Amino acid sequence: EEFVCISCVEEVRYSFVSHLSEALRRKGINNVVVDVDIDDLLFKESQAKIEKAGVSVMVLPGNCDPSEVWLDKFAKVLECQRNNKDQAVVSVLYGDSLLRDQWLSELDFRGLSRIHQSRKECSDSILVEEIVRDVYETHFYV
């Protein structure tokens, strides 16, 4: 049973991410959520979730400067990918005031090219469906 690991900051754990998780489940795609804001104690005990995931969906705080977010919070998520080079990484730039050019630069530097983004007056429900369709058709549909 392949599954998806969604990583995020605590601010969207119970809002946007909860809808994303439920939409994946409705599609028949098992998933777990990892809050990157937890102590590195609990993170160590959660690393296996990320490492064993067939798909890693990183939901990024797109309103924030990547220079204060990536190394601090998300580098530890991506490093889990090499314990599984069958693992795909999908990135989501989420927020109502994206530092879009900054994040696109950041993701390119990290070698990440599969990117979904919040858009002006585009509904989050549509964004969720877009992420689900991508994960589903790429990895759970043949």
Site of interaction with a copy of itself (CB under 8 A): 14-16, 18-19, 21-22, 96, 121-126, 128
Q: 16 contacts which partner out of a copy of itself, Na ion, none, CB within 5 to 8 A by kind?
A: a copy of itself
> Any contact of residue 129 with Na ion (CB under 5 A)?
no
**Between 22 and 65, whose beta carbon lies closer to a copy of itself?**
22
Kindly tell me the sign of the dihedral angle through the C-alpha atoms of 44, 45, 51, 55.
Answer: negative
**Smallest separation, CB 83 to Na ion (Å):** 26
**Between 29 and 78, whose beta carbon lies closer to a copy of itself?**
29
Under DSSP, is residue 117 helix (H, G, I), strand (E, B) or coil? strand
Among 30, 37, 42, which Cα is nearest to 14's? 37
Rounded distance between C-alpha atoms, residue 102 and residue 125, angstroms = 25
Q: List Cα–Cα distances, 11 to 2, 60, 70, 103, 139, in angstroms.
A: 27, 11, 16, 18, 28
Question: Per-residue contact track with Na ion, 20 to 49, x per CB under 5 A?
Answer: -xx--x------------------------
**Smallest separation, CB 116 to Na ion (Å):** 4
Q: 116 contacts which partner out of a copy of itself, Na ion, none, CB within 5 to 8 A by kind?
A: Na ion
DSSP class of 83 = G
